[PDB]
Design a protein around this ligand. Structure first.
Ligand SMILES: O=P(O)(O)OC[C@H]1O[C@H](OP(=O)(O)OP(=O)(O)O)[C@H](O)[C@@H]1O
Ligand SMILES: O=P(O)(O)OC[C@H]1O[C@H](OP(=O)(O)OP(=O)(O)O)[C@H](O)[C@@H]1O
Ligand SMILES: [Mn+2]
Ligand SMILES: [Mn+2]
Ligand SMILES: [Mn+2]
Ligand SMILES: [Mn+2]
Lengths: 344, 343
């Protein structure tokens, strides 16, 4: 029978867990039956042991079993996510949130998982909130947002109430652990595609492994400068997940005509500063930030195409649609229509 | 930089040895109620899986000792010895350290024993002593009087380390052994300079030895090659011998002193009442495998005391230990120990 001394002892002995043990642990944590000390011990122990795809898969599986689902037949089968682990410690503009809006305006259904900042000044949820977008909608209203606007936002705490004990321990110990991976892996709407950012180069492959087990079409991205984003300051490492297999690639924006940028050119601020930065990009303003948004939006579109079916043509078409979605004003319009939807 | 949990924990998760003072900072935060249980647990686990260094463990123990209740000045003889282990060998044996401690004290060697109740066994040293009528929870002044009048004193770790309670609680909750399990033997409040120190975790005995070496203590850190945190009689033992601030590892065979091979079955104990009866049995002069184990461990502590020639030291240790029992001195010392607590 499973117990904490058994599982913790196994992890501290640097052993992989038996099937079901990670699942048992997470379920204890989600049902409020685990002491903070046990939660912390488990989180740390698994991280230093080096999590397997199976183990992390079991953790996310439990979370999704307890998560508030969206109503049946309300999420298109080709819906995409654009979200990162966060915690790169750079405080950039909200590239995922900006990319998600552009991708939606390009005609790709987007059901975005998100959350407030943890280590940054303003996270996606914070910036969206500052734009007038509603980040408090339940399953039904998110479904309506998807249908009517083309984009929905699932605020993780709203859909994962049982995760509050784990989230508290994350806050207390501060150090990143395997828990930092679970957000991007537990979109309640369960889209089968997405552009997933990972700040931790050593854990990106594991994330990709989990998505692969689900037969998802995902690009797990880690900027070689440390961003949990497709960066423009240098190359990016992409773990391409397609047909249940992971393929490690290095991506260079220069190969698609993009100039190198400095990190301070992508720097952000508070929610109001970042909101203004969203408006600028969608407004047609050229520069480093636009390039970053277009590239990331294109990545999400590449991930989308990996569902129904190569690499260079997909990116070239992705870059086209993302740029066009901005230049026609569609992305700017979608945001406006999104804000109005909430007030209605 | 600014000391913080994200910093230190982050360093441990990255599998880097800590900088000087960081381990001390962490332990001090824990020892002052300024650490959340989650932070306590994260640190304990992280410090364990990285693999703690002698420097780091030394800082943890140091902080504990800098907070602990000390014994009054000039109450602890300079040649006082300790007999204690980390516990957690998994084998429910009789209480060899406590029994040896009584024998050693009866032989004339001052013993100030550190100790605690059971954590995973059916009965710890403190539990068995309590069942014998010995007062275990005495404060500094009375432990000093005990040491003077009786020739032995017992420091109950919860009594002398009240600020360790938060760490102790967390250890209880997570169950798994951590670096904290090493601290007990390393934090005797009376700070005896010699001792026989048991370590259940073979891979960490050298670390414990390094800590004692840093204090230039005369210590034998023992790990039975059958898993016991004791000098065993079922097979050979690993001894990390600490003398002159230097550690030297070696294999020890009690057969070289005439001791027959025993089996773990013969050293098995039970609850406090059973183990207490086992103590009375040995001190009564009963021959058998239990007596051999006690005399062996008692001798080791005497050898450690002497460290303040290897073979002759053991021969005199085994001789003095056997005599302390057979003369009835060890039995009498226990009885006198009980009367002290009752007056
Ligand atoms: O504070 P951090 O730990 O650094 O994380 C920053 C944000 O990144 C994650 O979401 P998201 O991918 O949507 O962020 P983004 O839109 O800004 O790119 C996370 O939910 C945070 O909101
Ligand atoms: O339950 P455990 O975790 O296994 O530990 C058993 C005992 O060992 C330690 O003391 P001590 O060295 O005095 O033990 P002993 O007298 O029985 O030999 C510890 O303080 C416990 O009292
Ligand atoms: Mn992001
Ligand atoms: Mn980011
Ligand atoms: Mn012992
Ligand atoms: Mn023992």
């Amino acid at each position: 029978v499973p117990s904490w001394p058994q599982i913790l002892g196994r992890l501290t002995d640097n052993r992989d867990l038996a099937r079901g043990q990670a699942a048992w642990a997470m379920d204890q944590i989600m049902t409020g039956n685990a002491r903070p000390a046990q939660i912390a011990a488990f989180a740390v122990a698994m991280t230093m042991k080096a999590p397997t795809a199976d183990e992390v898969g079991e953790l996310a599986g439990v979370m999704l079993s307890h998560a508030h689902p969206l109503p049946a037949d309300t999420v298109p089968d080709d819906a995409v996510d654009v979200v990162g682990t966060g915690g790169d410690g750079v405080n950039t503009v909200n590239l995922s949130t900006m990319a998600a809006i552009v991708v939606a305006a390009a005609g790709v259904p987007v059901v975005k998982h998100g959350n407030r900042a943890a280590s940054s000044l303003s996270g996606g949820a914070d910036t969206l909130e500052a734009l007038g977008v509603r980040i408090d909608l339940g399953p039904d209203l998110v479904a309506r947002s998807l249908a009517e606007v083309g984009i929905g936002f699932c605020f993780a705490p709203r859909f994962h109430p049982s995760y509050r004990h784990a989230a508290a321990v994350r806050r207390e110990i501060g150090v990143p652990t395997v828990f930092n991976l679970l957000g991007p892996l537990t979109n309640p709407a369960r889209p089968r595609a997405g552009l997933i950012g990972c700040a931790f180069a050593d854990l990106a492959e594991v994330m990709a492994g989990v998505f692969a087990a689900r037969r998802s079409s995902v690009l797990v991205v880690h900027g070689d400068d440390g961003l949990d984003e497709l960066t423009t300051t240098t190359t990016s490492t992409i773990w391409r997940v397609a047909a249940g297999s992971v393929d490690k690639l290095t991506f260079d924006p220069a190969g698609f005509g993009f100039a190198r940028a400095q990190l301070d050119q992508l720097a952000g601020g508070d929610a109001q500063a970042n909101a203004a930065a969203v408006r600028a990009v969608l407004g047609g303003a050229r520069g480093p930030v636009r390039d970053a948004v277009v590239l990331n939006a294109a990545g999400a579109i590449v991930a989308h195409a990996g569902l129904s079916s190569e690499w260079l043509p997909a990116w070239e078409e992705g870059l086209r649609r993302a740029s066009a979605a901005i230049d026609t004003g569609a992305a700017e319009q979608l945001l406006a229509r999104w804000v109005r939807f909430g007030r209605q």
